[model samples]
Target chain A: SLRIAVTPTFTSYFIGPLMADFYARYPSITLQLQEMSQEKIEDMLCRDELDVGIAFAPVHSPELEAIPLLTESLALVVAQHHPLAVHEQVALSRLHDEKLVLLSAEFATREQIDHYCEKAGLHPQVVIEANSISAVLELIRRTSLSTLLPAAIATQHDGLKAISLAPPLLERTAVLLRRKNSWQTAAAKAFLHMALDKCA
Target chain B: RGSLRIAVTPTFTSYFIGPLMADFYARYPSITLQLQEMSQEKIEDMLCRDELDVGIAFAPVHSPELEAIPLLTESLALVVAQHHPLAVHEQVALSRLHDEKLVLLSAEFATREQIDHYCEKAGLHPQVVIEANSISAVLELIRRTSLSTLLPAAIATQHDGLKAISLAPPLLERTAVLLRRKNSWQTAAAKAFLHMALDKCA
Candidate 1:
């Protein structure tokens, strides 16, 4: 049996199905999964509390190492009735002066959005700032403001709609990480192989 | 003249942006720039309360009524003792970090989350020996012991003894941002100061 710490995104999308197949193949192995925010998982890994972690990549730690998994694009999440929702694709310039809702500054998604806007020479008008993705979604649902989220997240919620951006559409690589030079139990190794196979 | 209260993280004081803030003061002599050192959450709260005229923080904050300006993107680097074994590699893979003892900042800090995400993917649980409240504490521990820490490249360069290496798998990078009320008007001087800081401070 292996204890795996997974970020919210992985638990919701990648892990659930993969684990079922993994356990079926290795009936003797039990899997305990912990769903946590990316930050908590990193800390737990550093403490050697988790066997494996699935998250966004490039975690620079001599004690920790990461493997690139897949690349996901950043998307714009807007209320169904918002003016920008009609466009199949939105440009960064379209957001100028428009009320925007965003996640807390600590979120990597927020960092990407700001970077894109800065490069475009536009300062978005923000209407509300929240710490969680759900909160940002809620704010967009209740208001006319727009939000930018990962494509996976935007598609997960029904109340909101998403539009892809053209060229440099805020892409980031998903990755797997673990402590360096640690022993990998059979169960842990099995799960890791399954995850990679499923991703491929 | 209304005072323009600004909140900045203590770490910014050491960056080129810190000195540029003084340039803002010179231009907007009428606007009293109240600069304070507070956590990112406190800065967000103050900005929400209208207690701050602007806040310099990591760029990920989402506020409906706030405007964010990207200042700079910081590259993250791995820090380790000069004698650490991993130091020998030019770029190490995630699978390589299977059983190493890791030292990191407390979860309360923003960077910890990014580290967790990366580790979850590799399927290795790290042994965390120490947790500290501040970057300095983490650095000090790394300096005194054989443990390693993850930090922004800019900060790691300050200490001469610690060796910072780029991860074969790069960690999440931090972007500095200036936050302010969306519809608030900035004095010419304040705006100028911000521009100067963003362009010249780095």
Candidate 2:
């Protein structure tokens, strides 16, 4: 059995489908999946409790090693019915008065949003918060609220418009992490190879 | 006799959950407790999806598929650092929040839900200028920005440069609820943990 833990953001578009094919081809290997914050996942990795961790913004440390998995580009999204949907790109300052919905402050992406807002000196009026990408997308579809999320997840749903940013304002790197200098199980190493190849 | 899985909102995880984890393990050594930090709404969804055995979140999900038992009335205060502009007053009204920016717990949180519930009823909408998933982070931002936030009154008082104040209508008081699937089978370990949670925390 292999235990695979991932930050929730990675699973929506990446890990879910990957796991399906993995299980179908490797029926002998049982898997345990857990979604948690990067901190907890790192803790488990260092303690040798978890086999592999998929993290966004894995903290740099000598105790563990991380390899780049994929990059998620962020895009500002608004409901198609909203006035701002007509624009291809919107300035951070223009979002000042907009009522927005966003992923709750759990994901590392929220920190990037905060940094961008501070750089622009804009205090965004965030109205609704959802914990998952699906919920955030649903909120935009049902309400006039706008938000920033992975462009991949945004394009999946209808009635939601992605407003790309100028100069490519934001991107986050997700990495696969394991304990440094530690041995990996045969099953784990096999899964890792598959992950990198497919994740690309 | 087996594992008990509970998904809790991040608010509770950073607060009293560590002690509970230790104490629960100390009390029931046979059962393993796997706790994950998630938001209240996601906790509810996990409970419905059968991914979790129990959930700790804000009360009254009103979902027919789940049963909620009111745990306790957790007090939330509009808190600010000691030198913040709003710290001068002990009591403030909801209307005073109009022009001011709030460092909120952010959307998809039970505390945010409670604040929104009160605001919607009062015909007031608090402008969330900055948000963080962790209550500690929100409080940290509260200090740097010299802004105010709504959070558990206990942690607010413990944080340096932070002061917890009451609203005229007490806009942030909310109940912590213990939830489980309705008419679903629960393990003995889960039942024991539920009884312990209701006995102590509630």
Candidate 3:
């Protein structure tokens, strides 16, 4: 059996479909999956509680090693009919009037959003703090509310459009992480290899 | 003023809880909600233990000490991408899915348990290619790939690129319900929350 974890953002945007492939490829291996915050994932990985973690790069601890998978950045996502949807890029000032739904503070992506807002000297009007990405995305699809999510999400939902931030949100590398010098199980190695192969 | 400890089943968590919480906060700004996503079993257990003030989940909740007030009636259906081969149909038979590659919720979810029971009755063995614990993941895969799923009809109705076709021999209709410990003291927050939920159904 393999116990793997992923940050919520990656759980929906990246690993969901790949997990199916993993299951098909390794039917003999039992899998336990947890969707958690990056901080929790890192802590659990170091504690030998999670066999693998998919999260953003730049691990806070040296005891863990990260293999870079892909570089993606956040974009302003809104309903397809939203006024700003016509824009290829939206200015930071435009966000002043928009009602935003954002991930809560515990998520790493939320930290990045806070950092971006702080650096831009703009305080977004946050109306909702949703713990689930699916809820936020669905709300964006149905309402005039906007959010910051992976740019790749633009192509996935028909009712939503992604607009590049004028100054652009910082690009972060997604990585497959595991504890350094820990005895790797065959299931763990196979999952990592499959992820790498698919990303490549 | 008061804090409400609330729990919802996983599927409803993705689609229902967040928006409702937003509205709850907007109406009663002073109140705080400790919202969580858990299985129906956990929600019931926690409610009986007085650890949760309220819960939103499927009806027929297991605990004899709990009260379940039905919210909305929903039925499970074949949810597919708009371009899927079966999308043009008004409804399809369960046997039609025998050869189709499907994505579904894992067995741990209440929704999947219902789906399994219905499928078994129909003598349909689902060729499940993917089993996801997250409703968002299942829907996302449905949108991106040809894979279809069995979810509440309203789920596909709520999304733009998806279509929900009723099952021919129609699966059992499930009811969303508000649950609480029977005859227990309700917090002001819990009362307000229950009223809001009943209001939504109204």
Candidate 4:
């Protein structure tokens, strides 16, 4: 069985029906996806408890080499009924008084948003704080609250409209991380190549 | 002088809006400014229900009963420990925060929602080292330790040891707006003060 460490962002790809892209090709290779934090991914990588650590970037070290994947942008999302929904793009200062639904403290992107707010010297009026990204999208459809999210993912939902954040264009990159000095088996190379081909 | 009721978020109470208050008093001496502190949700509800005459709050959620005039948009910034190398950079990428220790306020804070959401999408799972309910407590810890925090620049500026760094571009931010009921009665005193406030601040 091949053990892989995965973050919440990509967990869906390896589970259930989505794995046909991989499992169909490698019928003999069994896989286990461990959902974990980025810190755990690094620790697991150091201990060789996992083969590849897929998460955010800056994983570079003497022991690790990370592969860049598709970049995702963070955008402001509003209900189709929202007043701002008509606007294609707006400045950061425009969000000041809007009710927002942000993720709980467990996620790293929360810190990023918090970091941006701190530098600008403005307080956001976050009305409902939730942990589930799906819940945020669902709740936004029925209510007036707005949220920041990936433009690609937000556009996937039915009732939510993803609006570009002006000026700064919030963006984050997803990377596939592996050990720099380790020897790769036939299976490891094949899996990595598949990831490189499909993870984007 | 006729009295006017004004409800503001705790964030505005930080004196970010202090000058506007002063200007209002100077411009409309005939009207009294009654300032109260409230959450954005409460202010929106009160305005829609015709309880509050004027509110400084988040932009309205698109209710027909509410009228929202945008005052400003505030982008968030990260405040990092002085000892950390990333602290020196004017702006740091979101990926740099993947394993960084986070010093933050828990769910009791309004901004906590946004902060938590910001990290999840950026693929950051911060090891939040110090937890405080007050934004001040988190900043104090940032100075003493190498821990970093995300916050609105307005709240972070007063802290002693933390340095300001941008989180990625187009930066994430919340919109501030002036709110009132769509068809509510407005006193002459209130109307004059609001225009003065709008002219001074917006």
Candidate 5:
């Protein structure tokens, strides 16, 4: 039996199914899954509250070891009627004068967006800022403001169109994290192997 | 001569307030101004101990004995390598960095608070790289590695190799405030310095 802490994205998309399949295979071991923000999960790993964490790769702590699992690209999310919505692939520079809706400053995605805009020499006109993805989606539904999102998430919503950014597409890697010296119970190791196989 | 100690964040030194302070120093040649560049938490510690005459901070420092004055607001800008894919876009949404290797200051930083807020809103997670303690270290990592960092637009502009991009769904505006002891009288020089910071910088 082991406790696994995972960020919401991983828990919703990958961890739940992995745990279900793993539990079915090993009836003797019980897996307790905890959901937290990536930041909180990292804190839990450092404090030894969690035996493992499934999150995006590149965990920074020296105490933990991370293994890559999956990679995906970021995409632009726009209403079906938005100008760029018609394009199969959009150039980053085309968004310069467009109105952008964004999340609050706490999220890493916002950081990526700002970096992109500045590099493109564009002054983004942010029309609204919200603290939740649903809120941003709701605003986009009601208005024409466009937002950048993960290609996975953008595809999940039928109300929006997902357009790839041309040339160099931004990609992210998901990883599994665990304390370097901690005892990896049989269940944890099995799950890690399962994730690698499934993602691969 | 009484020392006028001011505690400020390193980001402010590169972005909004540093140039103004330089101007203030030029104008007040006789005043002994001691400026310490530290994180906001450290600045609050100095204010608590009376080590600093004034503190310029990102978020409002809640203290019963301290008076806070709003100065100016700065937007958080994401910084990336010139060759990165997002750099191809003009405006990006918050979820765009979901899988990117993010360069961040340690979680103890005030900007980290902003980064966390924006990520939660976008429902996207980042693979954070090293949490460097200094902005220069962050920039260095970004230059050498495939990671991107977030900072104030003003600070990002100062680096030649990096580009500052705007977030699609705008994040919270970083409010820079001047903090001091409540009901304490400022020396003439400190008062003048504060006035110039608020009036001229604003």
Candidate 6:
């Protein structure tokens, strides 16, 4: 059996759609898919509980190796009719009074957003914190409330638009992770190749 | 110090439970919560097996060993992006969905079963383009593509750009319930969580 896990963020944004085709093409392989925290995914990979994991880059575990897939950057996401939606880019200070809904602190991207805000001296008014990425998107699309998320996420939706951040927030790389020095089973190798082909 | 293991169905976990969870944490800082999102069947089985201290899902659970307290009633309806033609309707016929492309929960969820049952009864077949178990995946697809879905009416009510059109002849209704093993010893954290959940429902 090949056990694989993905972080919640990527499970929604990236890897969720890939699993069905993966399972169908490799019916001989016994597979398990789970969504969990990136920390737990890495821990499971190191402990051999999981054969592979899909998580964001900069793996914390020294025992793991990562193959980067997509590099995403934080940007402003707002309703298509919002004033700033027409702009290709906007200064961070333009958001000084804007109400925002962002992922809660447990998500690593939220920490990155916080770091960028501190460095840029932009005190964004976060009116709500949602744990689910889609929930934040749902909130932003209906209300005047905007949010900071990967530009690809906003651009994918027809009702919303993505505005580039001036100087941009730090970029994040999505990665496929596995334990270092461990033998990659045929199933694991196939899975990794499939992900890289789809994501890269 | 105390800890509680709680399992919730994905629907509530995604749209409705966040504020209650936040309030519980602020009200009881000494308690640690392990919240797992799973299917209603899994919640009932785990509660029966004594693996979970509490659960939140649709009411009238399957296990005799479990007791459910109603938290709130949820009504499911047709949800569409604001730009969709159907969004102008105050109420929509389930039959009118015959031509609409849709995204929906997979077969495992109680919500999907409810939707399927209602559709079968009404002889309506909405073209299903995707079947995803994750609430996030279903909502994301609905928000981005020209897809629509059946979700809790409150979700579209609270969110922007999505409109919940009431289903004519009213599609389905389920009560969200708090679940625990019948007559099990409730830990301090479990008791506190129960109180907090009930307080919110009140």
| TM-score, B chain alone, candidates in order | 0.78, 0.79, 0.92, 0.78, 0.86, 0.92
Residues B1-202 of candidate 3: C-alpha lDDT, one tens digit per residue = 7777778877676556666776777677666556667788898999999998998888788899999998888788899999899999979876787877777888888788888887788788967766667788787668766778888887776677899989888876888899999989898878988888778768
Sort by lDDT, top down from the best: 3, 6, 2, 5, 1, 4
Model 6 agreement with the true structure over A145-194: per-residue lDDT tens digits: 68888887775577888899887776888888989999988888988899
DockQ of each: 0.01, 0.02, 0.22, 0.01, 0.02, 0.09
Mark the regions of model 6 whose C-alpha exceeds 4 Å error after superposition: A1-7, A11-68, A72-200
The true-versus-predicted C-alpha distance at residue B153 of model 5, in Å, is: 1.8
Q: In candidate 5, how many Å is residue A32 off?
A: 29
- List model 5 lDDT by residue over A89-174, tens digit each: 88877677677766556666666567766776757666445434544554455456677766666554567877888853356787
Model 6 pairs whose backbones collide: A142-B160, A142-B161
TM-scores of the candidates are 0.46, 0.50, 0.71, 0.46, 0.48, 0.59
Q: Model 2, residue B37: displacement in angstroms?
A: 9.7
* DockQ of candidate 6 relative to the true structure: 0.09
Decide which is better by DockQ, 1 or 3. Answer: 3
Model 1 alpha-carbon drift over 4 Å, by segment: A6-40, B1-202
* Best DockQ among the predictions, by candidate number: 3
Look at candidate 5 and tell me the lDDT of residue A36. Answer: 52
Candidate 3 lDDT over A67-122, as tens digits, reads: 99988888899988888999989886777787787877877788888998888877
Score residue A63 of candidate 2 by CA lDDT.
91
Error of model 1, residue A198, in angstroms: 3.2
> In terms of TM-score, which candidate is stronger, 5 or 6?
6
iRMS, candidate 5, in Å: value is 18.6
Which candidate's TM-score is highest? 3
Question: Which scores better on DockQ, 1 or 6?
Answer: 6
lDDT of 1 by residue, B1-202 (tens): 5455567763553333334544544444454444555678889888888887778888778666777888888656667767778767656665555556666766766677767876776555676645544454455456555657777766656556677777666666778888877777776655666677677745
lDDT of each: 0.65, 0.71, 0.80, 0.65, 0.68, 0.77
